[PDB]
Amino acid sequence: GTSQWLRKTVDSAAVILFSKTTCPYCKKVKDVLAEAKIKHATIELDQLSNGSAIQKCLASFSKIETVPQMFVRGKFIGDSQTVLKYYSNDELAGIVNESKYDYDLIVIGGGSGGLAAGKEAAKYGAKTAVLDYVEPTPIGTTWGLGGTCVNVGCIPKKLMHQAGLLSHALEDAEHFGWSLDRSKISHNWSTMVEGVQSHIGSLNWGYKVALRDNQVTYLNAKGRLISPHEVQITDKNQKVSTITGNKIILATGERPKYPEIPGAVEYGITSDDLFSLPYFPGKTLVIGASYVALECAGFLASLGGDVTVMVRSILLRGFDQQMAEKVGDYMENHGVKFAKLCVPDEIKQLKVVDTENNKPGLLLVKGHYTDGKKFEEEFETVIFAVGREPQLSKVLCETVGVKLDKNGRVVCTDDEQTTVSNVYAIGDINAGKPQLTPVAIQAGRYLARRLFAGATELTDYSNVATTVFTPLEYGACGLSEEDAIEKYGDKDIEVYHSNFKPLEWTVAHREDNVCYMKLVCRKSDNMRVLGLHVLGPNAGEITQGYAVAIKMGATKADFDRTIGIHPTCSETFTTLHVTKKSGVSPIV
Amino acid sequence: GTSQWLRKTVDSAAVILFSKTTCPYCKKVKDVLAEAKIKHATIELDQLSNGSAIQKCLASFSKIETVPQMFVRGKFIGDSQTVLKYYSNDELAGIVNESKYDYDLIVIGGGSGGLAAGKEAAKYGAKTAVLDYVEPTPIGTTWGLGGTCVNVGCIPKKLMHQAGLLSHALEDAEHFGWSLDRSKISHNWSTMVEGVQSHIGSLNWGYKVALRDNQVTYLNAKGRLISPHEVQITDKNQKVSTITGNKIILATGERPKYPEIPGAVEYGITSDDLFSLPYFPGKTLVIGASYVALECAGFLASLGGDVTVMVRSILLRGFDQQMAEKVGDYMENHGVKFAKLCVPDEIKQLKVVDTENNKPGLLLVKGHYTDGKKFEEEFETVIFAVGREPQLSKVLCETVGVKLDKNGRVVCTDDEQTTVSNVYAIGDINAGKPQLTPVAIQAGRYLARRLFAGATELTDYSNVATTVFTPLEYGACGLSEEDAIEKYGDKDIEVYHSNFKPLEWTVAHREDNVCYMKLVCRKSDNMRVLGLHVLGPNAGEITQGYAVAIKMGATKADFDRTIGIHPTCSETFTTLHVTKKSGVSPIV
Ligand SMILES: Cc1cc2nc3c(=O)[nH]c(=O)nc-3n(C[C@H](O)[C@H](O)[C@H](O)COP(=O)(O)OP(=O)(O)OC[C@H]3O[C@@H](n4cnc5c(N)ncnc54)[C@H](O)[C@@H]3O)c2cc1C
Ligand SMILES: Cc1cc2nc3c(=O)[nH]c(=O)nc-3n(C[C@H](O)[C@H](O)[C@H](O)COP(=O)(O)OP(=O)(O)OC[C@H]3O[C@@H](n4cnc5c(N)ncnc54)[C@H](O)[C@@H]3O)c2cc1C
Ligand SMILES: COC(=O)[C@@H]1C[C@H](O)CN1C(=O)c1ccco1
Ligand SMILES: COC(=O)[C@@H]1C[C@H](O)CN1C(=O)c1ccco1
Ligand SMILES: COC(=O)[C@@H]1C[C@H](O)CN1C(=O)c1ccco1
Ligand SMILES: COC(=O)[C@@H]1C[C@H](O)CN1C(=O)c1ccco1
Write the DSSP string, A100-147: SSSEEEEEE--SHHHHHHHHHHHHTT--EEEE---PPPTT-----TTH
For residues A222 and A234, what is the distance between their CA atoms, to the nearest angstrom? 5
For residues B308 and B136, what is the distance between their CA atoms, to the nearest angstrom? 27
Query: Contact B149/A566, CB-based, under 8 Å?
Result: yes
Phi-psi map region of B54: left, alpha, beta (phi>0 left; psi -120 to 50 alpha): alpha
**What residue of A is the nearest CA neighbor of B168?**
A169
Phi, psi of B368 (to 5 degrees): -155, 150
What is the side-by-side strand order in the sheet with A69-72? A41-44, A15-19, A69-72, A75-78
The residue whose CA has the least distance to atom 8 of ligand 4 is A434
For residues A462 and A12, what is the distance between their CA atoms, to the nearest angstrom? 28
Amino acid at B168: H
Using CB atoms and an 8 Å cut-off, which of residues 188-227 of chain A contact chain B? 188-189, 191-192, 195-196, 198-199
C-alpha of residue B430 to centroid of ligand 6, in Å: 13
Q: What long-range pairs does A581-587 form, CB within 8 A, spacing at least 24?
A: A581/A494, A581/A495, A586/A497, A586/A498, A586/A499, A586/A516, A587/A499, A587/A512, A587/A513
**What residue of B is the nearest CA neighbor of A445?**
B575
Query: Out of 1.20.120.80, 3.30.390.30, 3.40.50.300, 1.10.3720.10, which CATH number does the structure's domain A473-575 have?
Result: 3.30.390.30
Amino acid at A502: P
DSSP label of A97: T
Contact predicate A347/A267, CB 8 Å: yes
Residue A346, SS3 per DSSP: strand
Q: Which residues pair with B128 in a beta bridge?
A: B105
Dihedral of CA B326/B327/B330/B331: which sign? Answer: negative
Identify the residue among A119, A158, A538, A568 best suited for mutation to test binding to B, counting B beta carbons within 10 A and taking the highest.
A568
Q: What is the dihedral of CA B298, B302, B306, B310, to 10 degrees?
A: 10
For residues A104 and A73, what is the distance between their CA atoms, to the nearest angstrom? 9
For residues B61 and B81, what is the distance between their CA atoms, to the nearest angstrom? 18
DSSP label of A523: G
What is the side-by-side strand order in the sheet with A381-384? A337-340, A307-311, A284-287, A381-384
Extended beta strands in A135-227, E state:
217-219, 222-227
Phi-psi map region of B90: left, alpha, beta (phi>0 left; psi -120 to 50 alpha): left
Q: Which residues of B are catalytic?
A: 566
Specify the length of chain B in residues. 588
Instruction: Tell whether B175 is within 8 A of chain A (Cβ).
Output: yes
Residue A276 in marked binding region: no
Q: State the pairing for strand pair B307-311/B284-287.
A: parallel
User: Given ligand 6 and candidates B319, B323, B388, B435, which is best to mutate, with the most ligand atoms within 8 Å of its CB?
Assistant: B435
- Which whole-number Å values give the CA distances from A224 to A106, A107, A135, A160, B372, in the listed order? 11, 11, 14, 35, 77
Does the CB atom of residue B318 touch ligand 6 within 6 A? yes
Q: What angle do CA B82, B83, B87 make, to 5 degrees?
A: 115
For residues A440 and A456, what is the distance between their CA atoms, to the nearest angstrom? 18
b/e B71-101 (16+ beta carbons within 10 angstroms → b): bbbeebbbbbeebbebbeeeebeebbeeeeb
For residues A267 and A265, what is the distance between their CA atoms, to the nearest angstrom? 6
Contact predicate A507/B196, CB 8 Å: yes
Could you tell me what percentage of chain A is helix, strand and coil, using 3-state DSSP and rounding each to the nearest 5? 35, 25, 40
DSSP B228-249: TTEEEEE-TT--EEEEEEEEEE
Class at the top of the CATH hierarchy for domain A264-386 = alpha beta
Method: X-ray
Dihedral of CA B77/B82/B86/B87: which sign? Answer: positive
**Considering only CA atoms, which of B49, B552, B34 is closest in space to residue A548?**
B552
Phi, psi of A251 (to 5 degrees): -150, 50
Instruction: Tell whether B173 is within 8 A of chain A (Cβ).
Output: yes
For residues B455 and A59, what is the distance between their CA atoms, to the nearest angstrom? 64
For residues B292 and B269, what is the distance between their CA atoms, to the nearest angstrom? 13
Extended beta strands in A513-582, E state:
515-522, 528-535
Contact predicate B567/B502, CB 8 Å: no
For residues B463 and B548, what is the distance between their CA atoms, to the nearest angstrom? 10
- Which whole-number Å values give the CA distances from A263 to A267, A306, A374, in the listed order? 6, 22, 18
Q: What is the dihedral of CA B37, B40, B46, B48, to 10 degrees?
A: 150
For residues A180 and A193, what is the distance between their CA atoms, to the nearest angstrom? 25
For residues B387 and B257, what is the distance between their CA atoms, to the nearest angstrom? 6
Contact predicate A76/A12, CB 8 Å: no
For residues B363 and B367, what is the distance between their CA atoms, to the nearest angstrom? 13
Residue A420 in marked binding region: no
Q: Resolution, rounded to a tenth of an Å?
A: 1.8
All residues of chain B having their beta carbon less than 8 Å from the beta carbon of residue A506 are 159, 199
Contact predicate A521/A554, CB 8 Å: no
Helix (H) or strand (E) holding A348: strand A342-351
**Considering only CA atoms, which of B28, B16, B80, B21 is closest in space to residue B48?**
B21
Asked if the domains at A103-163+176-256+389-453 and A264-386 fall in one CATH topology, the answer is yes
**Considering only CA atoms, which of B272, B271, B292, B249 is closest in space to residue B430?**
B249
Contact predicate B323/B533, CB 8 Å: yes
Amino acid at B98: E
Contact predicate A302/A182, CB 8 Å: no
Query: Contact B163/A177, CB-based, under 8 Å?
Result: yes
Identify the residue among B21, B165, B178 best suited for mutation to test binding to A, counting A beta carbons within 10 A and taking the highest.
B178
Query: Contact B547/A568, CB-based, under 8 Å?
Result: no
Angle separating helix axes B291-302 and B154-175, nearest 10 degrees:
40
Query: Out of 3.40.190.10, 3.40.30.10, 3.20.20.70, 2.60.40.10, which CATH number does the structure's domain A2-96 have?
Result: 3.40.30.10
Domain ranges of chain B: 2-96, 103-163+176-256+389-453, 264-386, 473-575
- Which whole-number Å values give the CA distances from B549 to A570, B145, B481, B576, in the listed order? 14, 35, 19, 16
Amino acid at B369: Y
C-alpha of residue B116 to centroid of ligand 6, in Å: 21
Instruction: Tell whether A476 is within 8 A of chain B (Cβ).
Output: no
Ligand 3 atom nearest residue A340's Cα: 12
Q: State the pairing for strand pair B240-250/B103-108.
A: parallel
For residues A297 and A316, what is the distance between their CA atoms, to the nearest angstrom? 14
Residue partners of A353: CB distance under 8 A and separation at least 6: A279, A359, A360, A361
Q: How is domain A103-163+176-256+389-453 classified at the architecture level of CATH?
A: 3-Layer(bba) Sandwich (3.50)
CA atoms within 13 A on the CB side of A117: 35
Please give, rounded to a whole number of angstroms, the shortest distance from the CA of A573 to a CA of chain B: 9
DSSP B11-28: HH-SEEEEE-TT-HHHHH
Helix (H) or strand (E) holding A206: helix A189-213
b/e A224-253 (16+ beta carbons within 10 angstroms → b): bbeebbbbbbeeeeeeeeebbbbbbbbbbb
**Considering only CA atoms, which of A420, B91, B527, A578 is closest in space to residue A410?**
A420
Helix (H) or strand (E) holding B343: strand B342-351
